[PDB]
Amino acid sequence: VELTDGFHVLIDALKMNDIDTMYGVVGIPITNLARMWQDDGQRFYSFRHEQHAGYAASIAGYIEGKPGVCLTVSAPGFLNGVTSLAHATTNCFPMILLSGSSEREIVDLQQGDYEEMDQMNVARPHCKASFRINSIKDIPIGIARAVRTAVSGRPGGVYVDLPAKLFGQTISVEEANKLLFKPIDPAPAQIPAEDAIARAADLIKNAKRPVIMLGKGAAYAQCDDEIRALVEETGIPFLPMGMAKGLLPDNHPQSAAATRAFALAQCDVCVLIGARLNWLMQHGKGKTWGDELKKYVQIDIQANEMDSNQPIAAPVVGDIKSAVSLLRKALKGAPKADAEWTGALKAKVDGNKAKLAGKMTAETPSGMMNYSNSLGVVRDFMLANPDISLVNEGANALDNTRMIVDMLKPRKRLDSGTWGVMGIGMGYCVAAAAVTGKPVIAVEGDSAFGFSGMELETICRYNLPVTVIIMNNGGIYKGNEADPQPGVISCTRLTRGRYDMMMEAFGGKGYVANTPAELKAALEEAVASGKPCLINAMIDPDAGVESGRIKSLNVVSKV
Amino acid sequence: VELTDGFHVLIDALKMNDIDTMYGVVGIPITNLARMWQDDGQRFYSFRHEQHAGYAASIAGYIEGKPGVCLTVSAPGFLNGVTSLAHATTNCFPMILLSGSSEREIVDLQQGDYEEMDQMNVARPHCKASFRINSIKDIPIGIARAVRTAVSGRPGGVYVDLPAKLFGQTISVEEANKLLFKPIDPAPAQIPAEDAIARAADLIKNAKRPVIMLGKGAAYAQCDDEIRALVEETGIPFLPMGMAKGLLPDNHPQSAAATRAFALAQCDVCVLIGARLNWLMQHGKGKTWGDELKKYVQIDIQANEMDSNQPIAAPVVGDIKSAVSLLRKALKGAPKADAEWTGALKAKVDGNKAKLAGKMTAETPSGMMNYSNSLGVVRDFMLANPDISLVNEGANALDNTRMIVDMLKPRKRLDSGTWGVMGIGMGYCVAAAAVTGKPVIAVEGDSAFGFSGMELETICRYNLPVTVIIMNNGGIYKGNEADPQPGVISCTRLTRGRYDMMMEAFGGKGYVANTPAELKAALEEAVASGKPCLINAMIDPDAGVESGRIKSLNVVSKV
Amino acid sequence: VELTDGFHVLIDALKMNDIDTMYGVVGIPITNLARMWQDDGQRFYSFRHEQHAGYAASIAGYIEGKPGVCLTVSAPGFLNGVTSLAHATTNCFPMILLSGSSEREIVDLQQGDYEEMDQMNVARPHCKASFRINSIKDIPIGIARAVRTAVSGRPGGVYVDLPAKLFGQTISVEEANKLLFKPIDPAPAQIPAEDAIARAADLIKNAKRPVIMLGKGAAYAQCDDEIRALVEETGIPFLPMGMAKGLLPDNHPQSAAATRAFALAQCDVCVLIGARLNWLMQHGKGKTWGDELKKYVQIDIQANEMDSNQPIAAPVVGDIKSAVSLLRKALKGAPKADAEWTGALKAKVDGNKAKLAGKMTAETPSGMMNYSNSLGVVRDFMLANPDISLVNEGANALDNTRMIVDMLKPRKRLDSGTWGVMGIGMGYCVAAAAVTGKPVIAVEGDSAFGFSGMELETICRYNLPVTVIIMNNGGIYKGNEADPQPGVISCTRLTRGRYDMMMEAFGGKGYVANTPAELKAALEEAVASGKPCLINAMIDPDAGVESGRIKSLNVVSKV
């Protein structure tokens, strides 16, 4: 009777759930899992730190709608991975963290095992569910549980603990075949009732000044034409959140993105589609919303997200594709939004965009670009080459890129997200390249970059078509903060370094860009090369402001 | 400008969410909340221990489909309540535990505050969500969050922490009335996709030996007529779980309850409606399922419950009412289940019921009734008086009542549930009496009763129409286990006590029943009286078996 | 080769660590552990609820200085026990909760096992350490870890998870003998440095108005003569906390207990011996301490208890026996405290005691005793019969007993403790009787009693020499709060019940006491009988005040 083992049953179960890629870092007790995964013909991306393998997994989940899978070792490796899992869960990205763990007997008596930790218990605050697979016979069910939990309801992170003793267990191939199975419909549709839709429809029809807010939940849903149809049929102005950019093209005539403050302050009805009324929307409170309670329509798969911050006048619970489809039919043939309202917003958008144009054409000294004339080059490039992932993080580097760089296609913009995480950059690049097979451009604050910068080597090792643009202003927000004391560097300063040389250290191509012309030539060559590149963009140390757009959130001393 | 305070804003927010009843125990810092609730005209039931207030709240939730509300003090009182909250979440019963807590400054520095505990964080494993309301202005949103979390998705427990400093905060009546609101549609319908229903219809139409399993989730859904219609139109034999008894009348001709072992072992398609494939169903594994994987159809609102134990061939995710309605329509005109299958089960049920009838007719010596002839009296009574809640817990006292006492009406049988909790009895009695305004009968094992027995005084104090039957066999399972050493009583023995005298001690009516005839007269009189009664049923100490029906789950020494 | 099993190895390991008694409730999967424990000749006390078995265990730990052991079943049973474990840890009482748990495979995949819970993880906030013993071979080490953690450092609770699969494992007797071992010195002495003692000595010598505060840590230490020698040699006035009463006799001439407010407010140096500067001492802040920072000496085994609330001028870290012994030698021959100070306090003590005498002699109508003339009888009895445990809980019933009933012997008074827990009463009685072999008297508020009252049956079943005095005032604080609405009883009301009849229901002796004379005759007969008794003491419903001595801690509405 022929036998197989835990290693192979796990490999088979993952494949049966349509996993063909893992992101991780090897070591005891999972090195041979990664090896045999590769031997079987599957993809393993080895990173320089598990956190970045984890961030890769998180965004693979977002882009594909199936869980990104991260593989780590026990205690120290797991901890690094779980920080990323926490980020996945916060952002509603489907992800499975797989980690090796040590001996149950020793760990449970806290005796000081190799990399000792109750990883299953430690994971709980950071994921939807934390499981452990103890027996070879339970591998298929365990992986099914993990996948379903990751992709159903509000998508998010799942931890699966894999004790070292699992892998060496054996079972007959006959019995293994009998246990292996593919879950049916792991991310089911959830359809709202007619009266929930009708309530929303009535609110929208009676609105004088409606807006639609598209969140990354709407982008994640992959029902791009449904959402575009709703916007265009209703004639309602829309606003995208950071990663909802490109769901409809950012240059769509009904976009009110360039007059956000006025749009939100003056609207009466606001339709939230896969977007939380959280800190990014000032909790539906304060001067952002004209110091009044708006009439909110909200479409969300998570029932208890309703009334989290402000009373929701028309809650619609279900998956966005089902709900928007029904809402469209409910609104069939209804009058479009008032031309006075939409025309007023468009006039402001045109005016503000004209002002931005002026800023982007401004001339600066060599090696002293500002955020407008530098990012203006990236804007033009992305308008001409929209089928490219745009990774973005920083303060000024984040906010100005969100403003300036129009996305024409969905799920291309990948940024710091709900927790405003610095560190997602290089991991996001690896996963974006891996899952799309297309180029990636990253616009990185120089501080932001340092959180994941060593993964430049990972990007070179896999010869990925990634161009990293460092917005090198020489520090956090600014690069010119004075020494607080004699010979003492300010805490916000960074070396205005040759990141180009660091890229070249690992076989990539480096550029220095001192002017917009040089940045343009570098970017065009870099993307065309299809090879790993870094462009060191020399930004004026005085160009940025404190915390970018969220300056007012800082706590300052008054004594 | 007229002011109000946290006490009143909280009272009003609870009322806006249709809460008119709390179960609790008073003390610092919440006595005056309870007082003002009563002063306002709402109901407060004071118990002798918070655990029983908590169990009361949990079953109020099950019966009504709105969260039962428990009020406790800080640390020691909170802990008692949170054990019941854990039970509620485990059983999918909607419940809100409200507890006072101490000073944030002192507790957060672990300095030894009055009843010091981080109750919010301690609650987390035992509920769907644990919240704290710090500001008077957030009371309406906080309660909305709690109610929505309790009743939406899979219903369950929610903890709401109320720091002592909340209640004395003040606000204008004008501003408070602006903040107060009623959540729209807190427990929304969730409708499954057409293909999910079609997959279920296909399996049912091709089944040779189908069964339908009804769980307490089906009962909770309150679509009794729809479920009965599905059963009757398909002609499929059905089996109720413990608290699904009465969803369809237990004497319905399609019930296979009296031939459960054969039905489950021999079936091909099994339709799980609001019932988990957990320990109560032996995880869909082993001898009880003929050592094979059945074709499971499952209807559940919790997406990731699918494939928790065995592969589910037709997962139907959504609320049971919506799903059953669609499934019915998907099966319209299909032939009824095979007559040789349904005929075979009916013959077995008829034979088994005949054997049980023989047992219930058995004659026993005075003071030495067995479980059949004693519970046969309760059976006849409940058939003549079906509009009464039947509370039940114990081992033999539980299993034999579930078998013998037929329920004709839904949501009347209230038992130990998913964790097989001893302790639910008297709390369940108070809540059932309070929410139904009708009589309650409790069939209690004598050990079972001791977990909540002090609450007889609560039952007497509120003059509730509750008749408690103590199955007094003098111990756990049996009352005759030999002294393990000379002069040393066995750990399983209990005093064969005068529980009637204990009831009389608090103004209740006490009876001793030594024969079925005495039990019958006592029960009829007690229920008819409309007063709090206890019947001390004298059961043969040798009548029961080890752990009743779950004898085989015991761990025994073989050395 | 002869074999033994998990059951027997565990029994042997417990005995080797000097455990001969467990308190618990049986059921799957531990019934046969309890049975075989009894078969071996050890004591098992079966309760009616695990919480009270747990409270028993906690106080057995306090009285004996070795961990009280509580045994429960999985999930629901464990939860009940862990509430008591949390109380043990809060009070620094050594305790081990042993609980059965279910199948690792099933529980770890959250599949719905019998009584499913990660009990090990759930216990963590409530104990010093939470362990699980997976393998038969690790039982001796596991029990050693539990005992050491329970009794060393700051004593407290420990949870040991015992999966069902442990008990049936086998091992050769030869190998079992080799693994069994007794831990060496599980509660070691910890001796402070000379300079720590010298600092304290200097502070004490230079004090003008010193006081010594004795906490229950000092009582727990069992170095009664060391502490008495320190007090008498220094001539410093002392004050006992609630359970430190009797460490020195409460009628000792240097006791300042009867002038506490003045003593604490006017002292300059305060010596804390096994007593935390927590809420019981108003955190060393406010008018209790004359609104100033005192010069604190503190002796405690827990280093980081120092500076928890107020700066400690002379921290002495180590075990109380070692520290007090060294301090005595450091103070050898030093002048006694100023006679002006000690004489001033004694004059106030005599005056206040004379006033109390007047109250205790006061005459009241039959069935309307107050707290002074009723508890005056208990005072006289305990002065004449000091070798009796005095259990005490309630509000007015607690505070007035602490004031009125002088303890002459150490570790006899057992009360609500650090969390002011209602519920410790009947469990405390069982353990006190079990470990002392001497009588127990309980003074119980009627509300307090209801939290554990069913355990009267447990007290009768084991024929324990326990006399329960119910301070029956008919409610919480008072028994006469008006109906808030027509026909609606106030939340603070309780049935003024015949608790005497409840005692007699289970074979105990009941008394009703309407006057001090009747209370005295009843108490003398009850204690002399050596049998289980309850005295139902009829207290004036209007005698008590809101929350007793902590009235000012209540939160009251001002609108």
Ligand SMILES: Nc1ncnc2c1ncn2[C@@H]1O[C@H](COP(=O)(O)OP(=O)(O)O)[C@@H](O)[C@H]1O
């Ligand atoms: N397929 C889906 N259908 C409906 N709602 C979804 C779906 N996927 C995610 N969501 C919801 O989308 C929301 C995402 O909000 P958020 O991350 O705050 O977006 P943003 O940051 O763009 O505003 C979450 O509330 C989540 O429950």
Ligand SMILES: Nc1ncnc2c1ncn2[C@@H]1O[C@H](COP(=O)(O)OP(=O)(O)O)[C@@H](O)[C@H]1O
């Ligand atoms: N309204 C509802 N619609 C669909 N499923 C529900 C609803 N309410 C509860 N449920 C589900 O019902 C199930 C109850 O199962 P369980 O408590 O195991 O029942 P039983 O013990 O009777 O078999 C849970 O899985 C829960 O998610």
Ligand SMILES: Nc1ncnc2c1ncn2[C@@H]1O[C@H](COP(=O)(O)OP(=O)(O)O)[C@@H](O)[C@H]1O
């Ligand atoms: N043997 C011992 N030696 C020194 N300190 C001890 C010993 N046993 C317990 N303690 C300490 O005694 C203190 C007990 O304080 P607490 O419970 O607040 O007493 P009280 O409530 O009587 O004031 C704890 O800080 C604990 O660390």
Ligand SMILES: [Mg+2]
């Ligand atoms: Mg920078």
Ligand SMILES: [Mg+2]
């Ligand atoms: Mg019994």
Ligand SMILES: [Mg+2]
């Ligand atoms: Mg009282």
